[PDB]
């Protein structure tokens, strides 16, 4: 019998999950790190998928290889500048790590952050 012989095509869906089926989001877990060395060279890197290249791409932005003092999180880091020192908070929220943050320093206030 001769039949139709044509590919089968249609229309994908440009759907990720959904309301009616899409269990409630975990959170995406990004590695980052801000380095921090306190000759004054900051770098950070946050929202990344590898914890080597976040911890890497950190110490790219301190500016040196083995820039130590490095803040390594996969949540949010709040650096506060007190006077020259220079501290790091961390929580999974900006709030939280702005709370941290100014838990562990206070005095001076916050003008670094990233948050993963």
Not at 15 to 23: D, F, K, N, R, W
Not at 64 to 68: G, I, L
């Given at each position: 019998p001769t039949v139709d012989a044509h590919l089968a095509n249609g229309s994908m869906s440009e759907?990720?999950?959904?309301?009616?089926?899409?269990?409630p989001i975990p959170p995406i877990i990004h590695y980052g790190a801000i380095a921090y060395a306190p000759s004054g060279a900051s770098g950070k890197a946050w929202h990344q998928r590898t914890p080597a290249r976040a911890e890497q791409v950190a110490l790219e932005k301190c500016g040196?290889?083995?820039?130590?003092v490095v803040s390594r999180f996969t949540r949010c880091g709040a650096v506060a500048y007190n006077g020259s020192k220079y501290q790091g908070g961390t929580g999974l929220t900006r709030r939280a790590a702005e709370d941290d943050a100014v838990n562990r320093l206070e005095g001076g206030r916050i003008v670094n952050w990233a948050c993963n």
């Open positions: 759907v990720m999950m959904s309301e009616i089926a899409g269990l040196d290889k083995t820039c130590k």
